[PDB]
Design a protein around this ligand. Structure first.
Ligand SMILES: CCc1nc2ccccn2c1C(=O)c1cc(Br)c(O)c(C#N)c1
Length: 515
């Protein structure tokens, strides 16, 4: 009297699971928007130093001679490496001699300049306001954007662990509902904080609650369906993220103020919390705990939804108790973690799987948060990453059965990897080729997440299936944290952030051939 018999009795495929899939895949879009909002709410616009001659109208009325703004800009700001007015320093004493062309304007000492003690002036053509504009994340404070992104990712990790324990102890639907509420409230609060550390802390809390939402949605979606229909709903969950990227691009185009954007993104989660109550709790977990009457209630409700009351009429507590007894025990938790690495055969298999899990977080999140440097129109780039993800993800699974198993993993990492390395070599003059390659790079890098998830289970023995995936997700989260921090190497050179992000997938993909 195992649970699958009962689930087949009530109805495994019809109606109810479709509605549940809709109601649980809709929030994934807004989860993706919350995750990728940092690309728009923290965009760094073009800026230059504050100059009394230009910015101040009181000094504007005192200008001797009607000189054009370009001449004043050349006078007051030293030239920069890219022929632009240099960003982080200013002329002390209005240099009039620069007007004359008789002197080669190249002999300038570092003692002739001062740091911008009077703030900056930013460009407001595209973005009305970001966090960089508000709190002056410029010059000496340019290292605090990857800090914010790493704090958010660490929040995801800690929230995943804590919510895992809490959902294993209390249930699925309850933790999911309270996670919806926490996301909404924490986002609404974060949209109003005046100082940077408060913003970082509330983004941390939002990330924790988001991790809880994703985990509980995945588990509750898996536990209510027959084993034949698992990968189909995994594919639906995967497509949710691509539609979420498209939605992120659209909403970012709609609103161009970071506080309003954050409020608009964090608003619907309260609505999700409101109707999260009507969902039924997973019957398998209810059977495991020992509250049989609640299990019978959920089973009868979901059977009545599918119009299968006649088969539900025969359900009694005895078969539920038999299913309780048949459920395997998990006392072995302390044992499988060591056995994964202590086994000589399993030591190498895990590590290469670990390295493949590591490479996804390091490369994808290090680049998907820096679309400003890969092109001009970041509204269009966000849409295309979601668009290209659809044909590639579905088109890849065809090659699984035909081209084999071990070859798919190697191609799923090398080929997106070489797209990024080609971005360095190609001249910046051909911008269209630069942008199209980056779309195909990160667009095809998402297919690695799906292929590895499916392949992880089949290799390992049935005993250690769950624990093997548990390690794999940890390296993805731990690797993603180190992603943004690499951008701090950009001071040495422009090509260094791209070089490291391209070498890791090539080594990860080629090393997977030993599996
Ligand atoms: C914020 C998560 C996220 N944002 C995007 C944006 C585009 C494509 C995919 N994602 C994801 C994930 O798929 C993902 C990452 C890690 Br790290 C996890 O631990 C889990 C879990 N559980 C899920």
């Amino acid at each position: 009297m195992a649970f699958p018999e009962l689930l087949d009795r009530v109805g495994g495929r019809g109606r109810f699971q479709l509605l549940q899939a809709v109601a649980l895949v809709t929030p994934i879009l807004w989860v993706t928007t919350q995750s990728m909002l940092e690309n728009f709410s923290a965009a760094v616009p073009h800026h230059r130093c504050w100059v009394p001659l230009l910015d101040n109208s009181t000094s504007q009325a005192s200008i001797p001679g009607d000189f054009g703004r370009d001449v004043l800009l050349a006078v007051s700001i030293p030239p920069g490496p890219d022929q632009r007015p240099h960003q982080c320093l200013r002329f002390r004493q209005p240099q009039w001699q620069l007007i004359e062309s008789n002197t080669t304007a190249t002999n300038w000492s570092d003692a002739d300049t001062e740091p911008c003690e009077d703030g900056w002036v930013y460009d407001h053509s595209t973005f009305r306001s970001t966090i960089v504009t508000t709190w002056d994340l410029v010059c000496d404070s340019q290292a605090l954007r990857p800090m914010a992104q790493s704090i958010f990712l660490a929040g995801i990790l800690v929230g995943a662990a804590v919510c895992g324990h809490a959902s294993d102890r209390f249930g699925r639907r309850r933790v999911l509902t309270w996670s919806y509420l926490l996301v909404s409230v924490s986002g609404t609060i974060a949209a109003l904080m005046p100082t940077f550390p408060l913003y970082c802390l509330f983004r941390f809390l939002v990330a924790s609650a988001v991790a809880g939402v994703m985990m509980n949605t995945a588990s509750l979606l898996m536990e209510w369906t027959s084993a034949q229909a698992g990968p189909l709903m995994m594919t639906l969950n995967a497509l949710g993220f691509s539609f979420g990227q498209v939605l992120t691009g659209s909403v970012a185009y709609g609103v161009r103020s970071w506080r309003m954007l954050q409020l608009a993104v964090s608003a619907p989660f309260f609505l999700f919390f409101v109707y999260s109550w009507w969902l039924p709790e997973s019957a398998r977990w209810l059977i495991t705990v020992g509250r049989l009457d609640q299990s019978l209630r959920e089973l009868q409700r979901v059977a009545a939804v599918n119009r299968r009351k006649a088969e539900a009429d025969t359900l009694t507590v005895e078969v539920l108790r038999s299913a309780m007894q048949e459920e395997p025990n998990g006392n072995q938790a302390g044992a499988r973690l060591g056995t994964l690495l202590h086994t000589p055969g399993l030591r190498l298999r895990t590590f290469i799987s670990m390295l493949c899990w590591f490479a996804f977080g390091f490369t994808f999140f290090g680049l998907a948060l820096d679309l400003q440097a890969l092109g001009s129109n970041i509204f269009l780039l966000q849409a295309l990453i979601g668009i290209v993800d659809l044909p590639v993800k579905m088109g890849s699974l065809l090659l699984l059965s035909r081209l084999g198993r071990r070859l798919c993993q190697a191609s799923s990492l090398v080929l997106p990897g070489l797209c990024i390395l080609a971005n360095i070599l190609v001249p910046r003059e051909m911008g269209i080729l630069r942008s199209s390659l980056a779309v195909l790079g990160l667009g095809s890098l998402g297919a690695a997440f799906t292929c590895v998830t499916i392949f992880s289970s089949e290799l390992f023995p049935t005993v250690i299936r769950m624990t093997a995936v548990g390690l794999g997700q940890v390296a993805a989260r731990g690797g993603a944290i180190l992603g943004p921090l690499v951008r701090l190497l950009g001071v040495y050179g422009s090509w260094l952030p791209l070089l490291v992000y391209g070498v890791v997938p090539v080594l990860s993909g080629l090393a997977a051939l030993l599996l």
